[PDB]
Structure 1
């Protein structure tokens, strides 16, 4: 049974983790990593690592990614110890600050050294934060890409595409944080449940090990044309930087009730295939959940660009 850990690094990453702790994911271990002792003290994470006590005296890294990097390197043994035994690690962080930008790639590097399939989920700053913030964040993203197995990048500007003029900022932030939450829940489902056409953690590693940026999504529909609608929703991910176009690897699962038809499954798979590379390494799964009535749920991860 694969062990999952979710690690928040710096403010934005810990914000994401705090929402997940609030909802509950009993089988998943949450780890909070920060330079900022005040923020870390308020976290309800079961496992906390204050990095850079010597460097920052319990303050943040003040927008200097070199300080975040050095803080993580200084606490390497603590980070190793907290990760040890994980089969899969998610590292969540907002790029552009001091702590996440610098520390998150070190954490991801350690995770992979400890043997974990390592997935980064990171944001790029809003354009309103300025070119400097954006340039620091880009360096972070590239460092993350080099350290992880697979990277999911959410430009914060994409949040401006999903709000109306009154949508509360915290509600917009919840939508961005749901990318991580739904990714973790979906992998938990994959590991826990034996499928009629079973996918397991070795299939996840095949598609996700030593890749780069990825598209992930989930689509739910019912009624007429449900399979096509669910597939299209799964592959259209308005918050992610990466599109499915040209994908060389896909992991795809369809979950339906007892009415799930072979014809529908083909329709959904063809939607996903059509979008990917013609030599796509596609691994397809199915689970029948008799508790469902007319809903279909299509889950996709696409890698290799």
Structure 2
């Protein structure tokens, strides 16, 4: 029984965590860390830590987290797995996320970062800051999944508003966390457990994700094809040496269709790729199946 903690740090990470809670993500403890007590008050996270109270600058965010490092470690003690989520580009997330991940990693927890890069329209300073924060977080994570927000706009609705675009960013962060955690907490016919996940995500390094869903005839092939070709994968599926694939569906998700999706992914992967295939029971999906691919080792 793996103990999994999902940390959202900074407004962006805390927003993402609230979304995970609202969408019913289970089997995990939610931890919100921010430099804003009022925002935290509104959060439904299980644990809430307000940091840097005496002090969008990443250094201020780094020091607030460093100053609270004993406290953060005490909250993470006992976790088998720690997710560190943030919207890179601001101060608290950018600066603080590497501190949290270092602590988790020192404790020996399987440490997964899942972060967004800001949209280009947010400006060059947020983009430059996100890039430094990402390199920093990369050093302290087993796997760092980076989601380019720019690529989210090549999906979804063309008349998308600004709020809709940021909600989409939150959603994809949820998708990245849940695609992994549900294998462990609510497995289907093919049970991929914590030890399996740990084997493929330990020291895997920088990673990209792809997501697809579909309903009806050939739903599994279609969802897997969509996920394989996801703009978020940056057409780097062919080069990945490690791939973790998650397929979620109702209790009637059959092995034949699981296998059809798995076969499609093998044919699209690098010849030497290590690919783990797992399934999730999610009775709330109806006739739809949801495929998630995590690609690493390029």
Asked if 1:87 corresponds to 2:80, the answer is yes
Is the Cα–Cα contact under 8 Å of residues 95 and 136 in structure 1 kept in the other structure?
yes
Shift of 1:138: 0.6
Candidates 270, 279, 293, aligned match of 1:277: 270
Aligned-residue CA RMSD (Å): 2.8
| Residue 131 of structure 2: aligned partner | 138
Q: TM-score, normalised by structure 2?
A: 0.87
Counterpart CA distance in 1 for 2:12 and 2:268 is 32
Counterpart CA distance in 2 for 1:187 and 1:230 is 17
Shift of 1:163: 5.2
| Residue 35 of structure 2: aligned partner | 35
**Residues 224 and 192 of structure 1: CA distance in aligned 2, closer, same or farther (over 3 Å):** same
Counterpart CA distance in 2 for 1:222 and 1:129 is 35
| Residue 180 of structure 2: aligned partner | 187
Give deviations 1:63-84, integer Å, cap 9, x for gaps: 2211111111111001001111
| Residue 143 of structure 2: aligned partner | 150
**Superposed counterparts of 1:1-305, under 5 Å:** 1-54=1-54, 56=55, 63-162=56-155, 164=157, 166-193=159-186, 195-239=188-232, 243-254=236-247, 260=254, 262=256, 264-285=257-278, 296-305=289-298
**Residues 269 and 106 of structure 1: CA distance in aligned 2, closer, same or farther (over 3 Å):** same
Counterpart CA distance in 2 for 1:102 and 1:160 is 26
Is the Cα–Cα contact under 8 Å of residues 187 and 279 in structure 2 kept in the other structure?
no
Aligned residue-pair number = 297
Shift of 1:141: 0.8
Give structure 2 stretches of 5+ with no counterpart.
Answer: none
Higher alpha-carbon Rg: 1
Give structure 1 stretches of 5+ with no counterpart.
Answer: 57-62
Describe the SS at the equivalent of 1:221: strand
| Residue 60 of structure 1: aligned partner | none
Give deviations 1:255-297, integer Å, cap 9, x for gaps: 66668364x5554223212332211112234578999996555
Give deviations 1:158-202, integer Å, cap 9, x for gaps: 233335554232222222212232333333432234554431111
Q: TM-score, normalised by structure 1?
A: 0.85
Give deviations 1:197-221, integer Å, cap 9, x for gaps: 4311111111111122223344333
Query: Stretches of 4+ moved more than 6 A in 1?
Result: 287-294
Give deviations 1:113-145, integer Å, cap 9, x for gaps: 122211111122222232222111110111111
**Residues 259 and 97 of structure 1: CA distance in aligned 2, closer, same or farther (over 3 Å):** closer
Is the Cα–Cα contact under 8 Å of residues 154 and 241 in structure 1 kept in the other structure?
no
Describe the SS at the equivalent of 1:30: strand
**Residues 146 and 191 of structure 1: CA distance in aligned 2, closer, same or farther (over 3 Å):** same
Shift of 1:240: 5.2
**Residues 285 and 130 of structure 1: CA distance in aligned 2, closer, same or farther (over 3 Å):** closer
Counterpart CA distance in 2 for 1:271 and 1:97 is 39
Counterpart CA distance in 1 for 2:109 and 2:76 is 8
Counterpart CA distance in 2 for 1:238 and 1:292 is 24
